[PDB]
Amino acid sequence: IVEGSDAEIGMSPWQVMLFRKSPQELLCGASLISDRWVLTAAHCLLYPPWDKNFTENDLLVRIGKHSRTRYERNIEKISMLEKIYIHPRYNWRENLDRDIALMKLKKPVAFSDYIHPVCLPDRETAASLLQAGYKGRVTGWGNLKETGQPSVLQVVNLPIVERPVCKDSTRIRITDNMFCAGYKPDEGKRGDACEGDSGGPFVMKSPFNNRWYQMGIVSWGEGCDRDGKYGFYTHVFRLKKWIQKVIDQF
């Protein structure tokens, strides 16, 4: 996260670290949506152009963390993957359309002060909150600059951007399954996700019921925190029928 700040303890208790076993490194962010299910970006697991194709045995999920590098004894929980489910129409060839994946844990994780699931939006949630200028929050252990790494989880709040502005900022074809967020050059504030943060959550706190909802997944961008560029996010509500289908079947 570029131009963010240290998270408070327990501020993002749904935050998940996807941790590569060998070599030991941060792969991506992710989120906890139940005791058994973790949400992330498909590109964290599958991206053939870079020969990325993780299997369940390649990675671990670390939940309840604050420190990036430390083994947080008596606090974090480490979980193994039973199965990965990538959206079948994830468009890795072109524009990362439908950049979403689910991972089922081998055993359910116990909730605690540090570990707790985020809500997923329904249609009404999405209509109410996904409006230009409304702010959400992105968290992660990714790089602090495009070109280093944080001691603890970082947070930044960023406004949703008008769709024409998003479309005009990039040559990539934008779909209804994406939105963009970030400050404009003229706005003076800064902030973005970066390498290590992708797959993590973009959340908003409903002013109606005071709950946090995961509206987006960090999907893609061009560099990090560049003037006139915006981060792109997978639109979680738009892909909820698939999420429900997978959870209902498996």
């Binding site: 941790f19 030991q24 490194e25 671990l60 590098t69 430390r70 083994y71 480490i78």
Partner: peptide, 5 residues
């Protein structure tokens, strides 16, 4: 990264 048990 610190080793995990």
């Amino acid at each position: 990264f610190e080793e995990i048990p």
